[PDB]
Amino acid sequence: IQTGGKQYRVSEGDVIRVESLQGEAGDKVELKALFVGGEQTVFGEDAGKYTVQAEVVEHGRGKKIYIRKYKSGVQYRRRTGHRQNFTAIKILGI
Amino acid sequence: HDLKPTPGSRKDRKRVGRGPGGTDKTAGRGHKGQKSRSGAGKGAFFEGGRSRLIARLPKRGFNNVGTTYEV
Amino acid sequence: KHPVPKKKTSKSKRDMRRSHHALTAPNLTECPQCHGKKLSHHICPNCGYYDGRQVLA
Amino acid sequence: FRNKKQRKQQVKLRKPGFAVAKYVRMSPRKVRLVVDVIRGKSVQDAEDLLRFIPRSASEPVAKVLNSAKANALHNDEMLEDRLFVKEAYVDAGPTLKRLIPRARGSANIIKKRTSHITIIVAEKGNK
Amino acid sequence: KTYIPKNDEQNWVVVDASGVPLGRLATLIASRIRGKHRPDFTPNMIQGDFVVVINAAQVALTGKKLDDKVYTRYTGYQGGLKTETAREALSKHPERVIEHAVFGMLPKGRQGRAMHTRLKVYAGETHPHSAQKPQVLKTQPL
Amino acid sequence: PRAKTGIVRRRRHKKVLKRAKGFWGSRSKQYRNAFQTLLNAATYEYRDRRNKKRDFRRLWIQRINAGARLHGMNYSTFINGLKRANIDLNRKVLADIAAREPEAFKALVDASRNARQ
RNA sequence: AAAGGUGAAAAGAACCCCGGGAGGGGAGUGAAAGAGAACCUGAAACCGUGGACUUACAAGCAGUCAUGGCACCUUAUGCGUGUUAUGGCGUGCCUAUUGAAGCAUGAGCCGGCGACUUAGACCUGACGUGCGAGCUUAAGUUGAAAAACGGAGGCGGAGC
RNA sequence: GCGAGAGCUAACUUCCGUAGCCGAGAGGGAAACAACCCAGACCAUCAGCUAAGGUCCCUAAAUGAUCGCUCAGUGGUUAA
RNA sequence: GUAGGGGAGCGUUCAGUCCGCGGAGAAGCCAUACCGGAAGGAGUGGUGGAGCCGACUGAAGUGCGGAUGCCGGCAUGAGU
Ligand SMILES: [Mg+2]
Ligand SMILES: [Mg+2]
Ligand SMILES: [Mg+2]
Ligand SMILES: [Mg+2]
Ligand SMILES: [Mg+2]
Ligand SMILES: [Mg+2]
Ligand SMILES: [Mg+2]
Ligand SMILES: [Mg+2]
Ligand SMILES: [Mg+2]
Ligand SMILES: [Mg+2]
Ligand SMILES: [Mg+2]
Ligand SMILES: [Mg+2]
Ligand SMILES: [Mg+2]
Ligand SMILES: [Mg+2]
Ligand SMILES: [Mg+2]
Ligand SMILES: [Mg+2]
Ligand SMILES: [Mg+2]
Ligand SMILES: [Mg+2]
Ligand SMILES: [Mg+2]
Ligand SMILES: [Mg+2]
Ligand SMILES: [Mg+2]
Ligand SMILES: [Mg+2]
Ligand SMILES: [Mg+2]
Ligand SMILES: [Mg+2]
Ligand SMILES: [Mg+2]
Ligand SMILES: [Mg+2]
Ligand SMILES: [Mg+2]
Ligand SMILES: [Mg+2]
Ligand SMILES: [Mg+2]
Ligand SMILES: [Mg+2]
Ligand SMILES: [Mg+2]
Ligand SMILES: [Mg+2]
Fold first, then answer.
1. Which terminus of chain C is more solvent-facing, meaning fewer CB atoms within 10 Å of its CB: N or C?
2. CA of F53: how far to CAs of B42, F34, F61, in Å?
3. CB atoms < 10 A from the CB of D64, how many?
4. Which H/E stretch holds residue D48?
5. Which sequence ranges form a coiled-coil region, renumbered to this chain (chain C)?
6. Which residues are near ligand 1, the ion (C-beta closer than 5 Å)?
7. How far apart are CA B23 and CA B17, in angstroms?
8. Structural domain boundaries of chain A?
9. How far apart are CA D26 and CA D117, in angstroms?
10. Are the CB atoms for E12 and E50 separated by under 8 Å?
11. What sign has the CA pseudo-torsion E85, E87, E90, E93?
12. Edge-to-edge strands of the sheet including E119-121?
């Protein structure tokens, strides 16, 4: 159920933020499974045929974080800001 | 108030010290030295302790003014 | 010679030191006659009554 | 209401059960020591306990409990036979600094702490 | 995201230490105690099972060790560092060998200490915890 | 013209002291110790970001090892037969399967072993 | 040496209350007494009252990061906020150094003051500009809620 | 570390040469540990493969497989 | 990434100028989970009582944790 690195595990019908997928307010993106999000269970190429669909939900500048670094005795103190851009996705699994 | 200054026609000075940003500590000067010192006089022809090229060399001739001719 | 303290002490310890300095409350009773309040085994100070009268009102 | 100014116009501050020993010549912590026994107790109790606590700061403290009871009964129309010590505390005054000479040439700043002793009396009922 | 569980159960067993090397039973039990065999395993919870050891009297120690195996208990006091052979401690009070072993094999912070308690140590074939219905664990490497 | 600090310093300082809370003693209350405490705190934040990336990985791992062993498999052998049948699952997911989804872990096991021999 | 501030105006608080007092609680004045004469704001260290969550088998540069608990809901019901238990992890800062947690220097804490500047119509460069084989004034003069005049000298022009 | 000198084929020794490293270098390893072995950190991730180095428990990972050795706790500090 | 050179900027005052606010309330202060890559800067709520934000440009006594720094206040040691 993977998507730009991270695998995921969905049941049916939910949100999941991933990263900068293309399109805007309501495209229609689809991915090929590695695993059954529930019943009977099947895995791998035996389950790529079984796939999921998932409609877009939103574009996102996530929660703030800072990037600070320090090394003693040098005066090395670094201060930067950072937000990781994500996309919100509605699960519509086959 | 309309106006504006020519791009690059006024450079903002250097105020040394002030942060690690920045020119931390020292102020360009490094660590110790005779150079480190709030004090005049060094100066510019003072090589070494020593004796200088400047005074190591033959004094040739003298100095006459003369009539110099306009081209 | 001349021992001093090494480091300033904290609000925390310091107030753990004080943990006992807490005053104990005079355990009092009301004095069968004049009716103020007497200390057990002493004279009820208002009237002067230990069983009849002594020090005076 | 609307304006802060309007609220200022309309209401006024009433202080219910409160009185203040200001600028009293005694160190905070000492005086607290008396006062820790008054707090939250049947206000008359406080008048009694404060007759048999043998510390020096018994008396200014009691003086302020009659003031409170006074202000509470009169100025605030309260109920003597159910009045009590809702609050009690003390904080620092402007502490009074003078020099003491010492061995050899040295000198010393010796501080005569003052106290803002303060009690708030109130009505205590369970239901 | 990942699944942090809730500590129901409280599960009990009987390790029979009769004729087993110390270190081995030591790690078997240390592990059952720590919890590591619980796929819902969790590092700030003491999920682990309760271990009842019988016959700590009849443990196996490989020679010549019990005539070589020192135990050093320092006492604060000069000339404290007292000694004890493994056979000494074994005839004396054997559950304090087994205890001693299992206890080096469990974390030395607030947790581990507290975990110690999940150890019930005996000798012969008798325990008073028949009310805790312990599941007779075995001796394997799985 | 002269320009006192006037205001700026109190500003900087408060900034720190508002970062600086929950901190035990002086740390949360005096500037210098505060800002300071935060220098070190910086070190700990950075490293521990990547670090937690390690730690979680560890956690997932031990849970899977468990799982395997719960039947008769080693972690290494399970995961290897789950590389062999090419069942390219994240291991975070594998933990999830393992501890929240029983019979599924069962099957994935039987698979790995099959592909192993 | 440090010393400054009630209010628009003294209208400066008659008068009742606890106390010898000091001080306060009313009242009354005022727009405000959240200005009452220790009288503009009232930061921080620092001392206290109350409340939340916690803390008496525990080993600690006091943080971090992960999870559970409990609490709260005015940029705030989720990426939450406060607090906490358990875990992993973790050698204050500065300066000085071959090398600092260092048992090496400095410092009790918090405020506020505290240090790379100015001058010369000097030198030499980078950016820019205006005129450009040409470029330029100084002292002064006059006017001056403004500036203009001022070639005396300066720099370029040819080297050896 | 390799080359030599002064030393006592002493030194966390000193004076040259030479490579790398720290200095000005975090990250994993060597329990701990400027120099050593792996490796040069532009931010984010609850994603995957490896290096040195590891895989009984503490502490991630084979209490692995087969042919052996030592029984001395050698391993876990020296010699004629 | 240390000494160092370079690049772009954040904030403070005074000043010229414009946008403009303010007793239905200015600055300053106090709380907070918003925004900016960072210096920083906004929203609202409580304080206060008469002044001030913003843009562009100019000039600086222009940004402090250290100097056994200076002034002042308040802590420790101690109810000793
Ligand atoms: Mg360090
Ligand atoms: Mg610079
Ligand atoms: Mg220096
Ligand atoms: Mg030097
Ligand atoms: Mg009125
Ligand atoms: Mg004398
Ligand atoms: Mg990694
Ligand atoms: Mg009076
Ligand atoms: Mg409390
Ligand atoms: Mg214990
Ligand atoms: Mg406890
Ligand atoms: Mg410094
Ligand atoms: Mg030295
Ligand atoms: Mg020390
Ligand atoms: Mg020191
Ligand atoms: Mg020295
Ligand atoms: Mg030019
Ligand atoms: Mg030397
Ligand atoms: Mg150096
Ligand atoms: Mg390193
Ligand atoms: Mg290292
Ligand atoms: Mg290490
Ligand atoms: Mg070394
Ligand atoms: Mg290898
Ligand atoms: Mg393991
Ligand atoms: Mg202006
Ligand atoms: Mg102003
Ligand atoms: Mg200072
Ligand atoms: Mg000293
Ligand atoms: Mg005493
Ligand atoms: Mg003493
Ligand atoms: Mg004594």
1. N
2. 58, 28, 13
3. 21
4. helix D45-49
5. none
6. A 72
7. 5
8. 1-94
9. 10
10. yes
11. negative
12. E12-16, E50-54, E119-121
Nearest to A70 among F42, F89, F111 (CB): F42
Is the C-alpha dihedral spanning A32, A38, A40, A41 positive or negative? positive
Question: What are E53's two structure tokens?
Answer: 């050891």
β-bridge mates for residue D20, sequence order? D118
d(CA F99, CA F76): 18
Number of residues assigned to chain F: 117
Single-letter residue type at E65? K
Contact by Cβ (8 Å): E12, E49: yes
Question: CA-CA distance, A22 to B16, in Å (whole number)?
Answer: 48
Amino acid at B50: R
CB of B5 within 7 Å of some strand I atom: yes
Contact assessment for residue E22 and residue E61, using Cβ atoms and an 8 Å cutoff: yes
Q: Show the domain range for F22.
A: 1-117
| Residue ranges of the binding site of C | 31, 34, 44, 47
Furthest CA-CA distance within chain F: 87
Cβ atoms of E108 and E119 within 8 Å: the answer is: no
DSSP β-ladder status, D107-112 and D18-24: unpaired
CATH number of D1-127, picked from 3.90.470.10, 3.10.20.340, 3.40.50.10860, 3.40.50.2300: 3.90.470.10
* Partner-chain contact D55 C39, CB within 8 Å: no
| H or E stretch covering D77 | none
Question: Whole-angstrom Cα distance, residue E65 to residue E51?
Answer: 26
From chain C, pick out residues whose CB is under 8 angstroms from the CB of F25: 10-12
Please identify residues in chain F, positions 31-60, with a C-beta within 7 angstroms of any atom of strand I. Answer: 31-33, 35-36, 39
Alpha carbon distance D19, E87 (integer Å): 78
* Count of all residues that appear for chain A in the document: 94
F-chain residue closest to E142, CA distance? F72
Contact E89, E97 (CB under 8 A): yes
| Interface residue C21 vs chain D (CB under 8 A) | yes
D88 touches D17 (CB < 8 A): no
User: What is the longest distance spanned by two Cα atoms in chain E?
Assistant: 56
B32 Cβ within 7 A of any nucleic strand G atom: yes
In whole angstroms, what is the distance from residue E107 CA to residue E114 CA?
10
| Dihedral sign from CA coordinates of E39, E40, E43, E46 | negative
Annotated domain spans of chain C? 4-57
Q: How far is F25 from chain C (nearest CA, A)?
A: 8
**Strand A76-82 and strand A65-71: pairing?**
antiparallel
Give how far Cα E122 sits from Cα of E66, E94, E99, F97, Å: 20, 8, 10, 39
Task: Say whether E99 sits in a helix, a strand or coil.
Answer: helix
Residue located via tokens 């087994």: E98
Cα–Cα distance for residue pair C8/C4, rounded to 1 Å: 10
A interface with F, Cβ–Cβ < 8 A, is 2, 6-9, 34-35, 41, 43-45, 67-70, 72, 77
Q: Is the CB of F28 within 7 Å of strand G?
A: yes
- For residue C38, give the 3-state DSSP assignment: strand
E71, with CB counted inside 10 A (0-12, 13-18, 19+), is middle
- Beta strand ranges found along chain D (DSSP E): 18-24, 83-92, 96-101, 107-112, 115-123
| Residue E133, CA distances (Å) to E34, E66, E129, E136 in order | 20, 34, 7, 9
